[PDB]
C-alpha cells in the first residue's frame, strides 16, 4: 500500500501531460490569427517545447536518480503548471479585438507563448525516467509489466477531455464577459473569427498544479555514459526501436490524406466516428499485453520473442493494403485532353481546346466541377458553362461548352459542384481498409509494453534512468521531428497541380496521382518495418547465445 499510493499520483500526472500536449496543438490557429504573426514565427513557437525537452532530459535522468524522486516529479509537475498559466497573460494585458461567390462562368507578446511552451517542455522531463525506474526498483516478481500496462491504459483520458472542451471553447467569442455578445457581427464560419484560446490554458495549468500536491507527502557522469554506449544489445535495441517508431509516426501522420486521395471520403466520414471506436481497442490491447507477460512468467528472451511475434503478425496485415486499391480519377485537362478525346503523357503544358478557346480565364483557378458525363473539369470556365442558378443549393451551371457529349446532346448539360463520387466498389474496398486498419492497430498495441521492460533488463541495475532518458531523447529527436519532414518531402513528388500562392509558387497541392502516392507511402512503411524486424531477430540470436 506504499507503492499503490505512488501508483495513483503518477496516473494523474500522465493524464495532465497528454492533456497539455493536445491542447497546445488545438489552439495554434487562433493564436496565429489573434496575434497578427508570420508563418515562420508560428513554426518557431510551435518548436519551443522541443528545445526545452531535448536539452535537459539526460541531466535530469542521471543527476536526479539519487535525490528524492517523488519530490522531483512533483516539482516538475508544478513547473509545468506554472508554465501553462503564463501562456494566457497576453489576453489580459492587450486590448480588445479591434478587427471584429467567385462562380465565374465563361469569361471572354509572442515571447510569452514561446517562453511558456519552453517552461512546459522543461517541466515534464522527470515523469517517465524517474517514475518507471522507481516502479521497477520497488515491486514484486512480475508486477512491473501489469502496472505499466494499467498506466498506459488510464492515460487515454487526457485526449478525451482535451478534444471535448477544446471544441467547446473554440465556439465562444474571444472577448467573452467583457463585451456584450449582442453587437457581434462575426460568426464561427467567418475568416476573422478568433475563439477563446486563452481559456484552454487556464484549465490545463490549474489541472497540472493540482495533480502535483500528493507527491509532496509520499566525473561519474562520463564513465556512466560511456559504460552504456559500449553495450551492444542496448545499441541494437535502440536502433530498431527507432526504425519502428519512425514508420508508425509517418503512417499515422499521412493516413488521413491517403484515405481522401485514394477512396474519396471527405475527412468527416473517415475521421470523427473512427476514433470513437479506435481508442478502446488500443487501451485493451495495451492492458492485455501487460497482463500476458505477467501471467505467463516470461524472462528476457521470452519477452523478446513475444514482441517479435507481435511485430511479425502486425507486418503480415500491412501487406494487404497493396491488394485493395482503386483506379485513378479522371480530370479532363490534367492528364487527358480538354475535350476528352485523347490521353496525354505530361501533366504540364497541356494545350487549350476548341471548345475552350474563346473563354479566356485563369488556369491557376481550381474550382470543383463535374458534369453528368462522369469526368472532371478544373473550372466552370474551363468547361464552358455559360449559365448559373443563383446562390441556392449548389448552382447547376448549364449549357456547357466542353460538357457536350455524343448521345448526351439529348439530355441536360448541367454540372453540379463537387467531384462526382467513386463507384460502389471503391466504398466496398474502403470498408476492408478500415477493418484491416483496426486489426493492425490492435496487434501493434499488444506489444507496446516490451520496450521499457527490456531496456530495464538488459542494463546494470543502477543505470536504469540514464538508459530510459537517452532512449527517450534519441526517439523524440530522430523519429518525431525528422519523420514527418522526410515522408512529406517524398510524397510531394506525386503532385500534378500546385496552388501558386502570391509569392511562393507552391502554396499547396490540389491533387495527387493516387497510384504513385500509394506506391511511395506503403513502400516506405514496409521497408522500415522489415528493417526493424531484421535487427530484432538477430538481437534474439545474440541474446540466446549470451544466457
Ligand atoms: C443553350 O444556350 C442557348 C444559346 O444561349 C440557349 O438558347 C435560347 O435561350 C433562351 C432562353 O432559353 C431562348 O432564346 C431560347 O429558349 C433558347 N433557344 C434559342 C436557341 O433561342 C438555350 O436556352 C440554352 N440551353 C437550353 C436551356 O435549352
Ligand atoms: O502515432 C502513433 O503510432 C501508433 C503506435 C504507437 C505506439 Cl507507442 C505503439 O506501441 C504502437 C503504435 O501502433 C501504430 C500502428 C499504426 O498502423 C499507426 Cl498508423 C500508428 C501507430 C499509434 C496508435 C494510436 C494512436 C497514435 C499512434
Ligand atoms: C434540366 O433538366 C430538368 C428537366 O428537363 C430541368 O432542369 C430543365 O428542363 C433542364 N434544363 C436545365 C439546364 O435546367
From Swiss-Prot:
What ranges are annotated Extracellular (topological domains)? Answer: 25-43, 177-194, 250-269, 322-433, 492-525
InterPro entries in the cross-refs: Kazal_dom, Kazal_dom_sf, MFS_dom, MFS_trans_sf, OATP
Q: Where is it localised? A: Basolateral cell membrane; Basal cell membrane
Question: Which residues carry attached sugars according to the database record?
Answer: 328, 399, 412, 513
Q: How does activity depend on pH?
A: Optimum pH is 6.5 with prostaglandin E2 and L-thyroxine (T4) as substrates.
Q: Key word Ion transport present in the record?
A: yes
Q: Which UniProt keywords apply?
A: Cell membrane, Disulfide bond, Glycoprotein, Ion transport, Lipid transport, Membrane, Phosphoprotein, Transmembrane, Transmembrane helix, Transport
One GO-annotated biological process of the protein: heme catabolic process
Q: Got a GO cellular component term for this one? A: plasma membrane
The transmembrane segments are 5-24, 44-64, 71-95, 109-136, 156-176, 195-218, 228-249, 270-293, 298-321, 434-456, 466-491, 526-543
Residues exposed to the Cytoplasmic side: 65-70, 137-155, 294-297, 457-465
Q: Which Pfam families match?
A: Kazal_2, OATP
Q: Which cysteines are joined by disulfide bonds?
A: 355-385, 361-381, 370-402
Q: Determine the domain of life of the protein's source.
A: Eukaryota
What effect is documented for mutating residue 113 to A?
Answer: Decreased transport activity
Membrane-related topology note: Multi-pass membrane protein
Gene Ontology molecular function: bile acid transmembrane transporter activity; organic anion transmembrane transporter activity; prostaglandin transmembrane transporter activity; sodium-independent organic anion transmembrane transporter activity; thyroid hormone transmembrane transporter activity
- General function of this protein: Mediates the Na(+)-independent uptake of organic anions. Shows broad substrate specificity, can transport both organic anions such as bile acid taurocholate (cholyltaurine) and conjugated steroids (dehydroepiandrosterone 3-sulfate, 17-beta-glucuronosyl estradiol, and estrone 3-sulfate), as well as eicosanoids (prostaglandin E2, thromboxane B2, leukotriene C4, and leukotriene E4), and thyroid hormones (T4/L-thyroxine, and T3/3,3',5'-triiodo-L-thyronine). Can take up bilirubin glucuronides from plasma into the liver, contributing to the detoxification-enhancing liver-blood shuttling loop.
Query: What's written under domain?
Result: A conserved histidine residue in the third TMD (His-91) may play an essential role in the pH sensitivity of SLCO1B1/OATP1B1-mediated substrate transport.
Q: Which disease is it linked to?
A: Hyperbilirubinemia, Rotor type: An autosomal recessive form of primary conjugated hyperbilirubinemia. Affected individuals develop mild jaundice not associated with hemolysis shortly after birth or in childhood. They have delayed plasma clearance of the unconjugated anionic dye bromsulphthalein and prominent urinary excretion of coproporphyrin I. Hepatic pigmentation is normal.
Record-linked NCBIfam families:
oat
Which protein is depicted?
Answer: Solute carrier organic anion transporter family member 1B1
Organism this protein belongs to? Homo sapiens
The lineage, from the top, is:
Eukaryota, Metazoa, Chordata, Craniata, Vertebrata
Q: Which gene encodes it?
A: SLCO1B1
Amino acid at each position: 500500500n506504499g507503492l499503490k499510493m505512488f501508483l495513483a499520483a503518477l496516473s494523474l500526472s500522465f493524464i495532465a501531460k497528454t492533456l497539455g500536449a493536445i491542447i497546445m496543438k488545438s489552439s495554434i490557429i487562433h493564436i496565429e490569427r489573434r496575434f497578427e504573426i508570420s508563418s515562420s514565427l508560428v513554426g518557431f513557437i510551435d518548436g519551443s517545447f522541443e528545445i526545452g525537452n531535448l536539452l535537459v532530459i539526460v541531466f535530469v535522468s542521471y543527476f536526479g536518480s539519487k535525490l528524492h524522486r517523488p519530490k522531483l516529479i512533483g516539482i516538475g509537475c508544478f513547473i509545468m503548471g506554472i508554465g501553462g498559466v503564463l501562456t494566457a497573460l497576453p489576453h489580459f494585458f492587450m486590448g480588445y479585438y479591434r478587427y471584429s461567390s467567385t462562380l465565374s462562368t465563361c469569361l471572354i507578446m509572442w515571447i510569452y507563448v514561446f517562453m511558456g511552451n519552453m517552461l512546459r517542455g522543461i517541466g515534464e522531463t522527470p515523469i517517465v525516467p524517474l517514475g518507471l525506474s522507481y516502479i521497477d526498483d520497488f515491486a514484486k516478481e512480475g508486477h512491473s509489466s501489469l502496472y505499466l500496462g494499467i498506466l498506459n491504459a488510464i492515460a487515454m483520458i487526457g485526449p478525451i477531455i482535451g478534444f471535448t472542451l477544446g471544441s467547446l471553447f473554440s465556439k465562444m467569442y474571444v472577448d467573452i464577459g467583457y463585451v456584450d455578445l449582442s453587437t457581434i457581427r462575426i460568426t464561427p464560419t467567418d475568416s476573422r473569427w478568433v475563439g477563446a484560446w486563452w481559456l484552454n490554458f487556464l484549465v490545463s495549468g490549474l489541472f497540472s498544479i493540482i495533480s502535483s500536491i500528493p507527491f509532496f507527502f509520499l566525473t561519474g557522469f562520463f564513465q556512466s555514459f560511456k559504460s552504456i554506449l559500449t553495450n551492444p544489445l542496448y545499441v541494437m535495441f535502440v536502433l530498431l526501436t527507432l526504425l519502428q517508431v519512425s514508420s508508425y509516426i509517418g503512417a499515422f501522420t499521412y493516413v488521413f490524406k491517403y484515405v481522401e486521395q485514394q477512396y474519396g471520403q471527405p475527412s468527416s466520414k473517415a475521421n470523427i466516428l473512427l476514433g470513437v471506436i479506435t481508442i478502446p481497442i488500443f487501451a485493451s490491447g495495451m492492458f492485455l499485453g501487460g497482463y500476458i507477460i505477467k501471467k505467463f512468467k516470461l524472462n528476457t528472451v521470452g519477452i523478446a520473442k513475444f514482441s517479435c511475434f507481435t511485430a511479425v503478425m502486425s507486418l503480415s496485415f500491412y501487406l494487404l493494403y497493396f491488394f485493395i486499391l482503386c483506379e485513378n480519377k479522371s480530370v479532363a485537362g490534367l492528364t487527358m485532353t480538354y475535350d476528352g478525346n485523347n490521353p496525354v503523357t505530361s501533366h504540364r503544358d497541356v494545350p487549350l481546346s476548341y471548345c475552350n478557346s474563346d473563354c479566356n480565364c485563369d488556369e491557376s483557378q481550381w474550382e470543383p466541377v463535374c458534369g453528368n458525363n462522369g469526368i472532371t473539369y478544373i473550372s466552370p470556365c474551363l468547361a464552358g458553362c455559360k449559365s448559373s442558378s443563383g446562390n441556392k443549393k449548389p448552382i447547376v451551371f448549364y449549357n456547357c461548352s466542353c460538357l457536350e457529349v455524343t448521345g448526351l446532346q439529348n439530355r441536360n448539360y448541367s454540372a453540379h459542384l463537387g467531384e462526382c463520387p467513386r463507384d460502389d466498389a471503391c466504398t466496398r474496398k474502403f470498408y476492408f481498409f478500415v477493418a484491416i486498419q483496426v486489426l493492425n492497430l490492435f496487434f501493434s498495441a499488444l506489444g507496446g509494453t516490451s520496450h521499457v521492460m527490456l531496456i530495464v533488463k538488459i542494463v546494470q541495475p543502477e543505470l536504469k534512468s540514464l538508459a530510459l532518458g537517452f532512449h527517450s531523447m534519441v526517439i523524440r529527436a530522430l523519429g518525431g521531428i525528422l519523420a514527418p519532414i522526410y515522408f512529406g518531402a517524398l510524397i510531394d513528388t506525386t503532385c500534378i497541380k500546385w496552388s501558386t500562392n502570391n509569392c511562393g509558387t507552391r502554396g499547396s497541392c490540389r491533387t495527387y496521382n493516387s497510384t504513385s502516392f500509394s506506391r511511395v507511402y506503403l513502400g516506405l512503411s514496409s521497408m522500415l518495418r522489415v528493417s526493424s524486424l531484421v535487427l530484432y531477430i538477430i538481437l534474439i540470436y545474440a541474446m540466446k547465445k549470451k544466457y
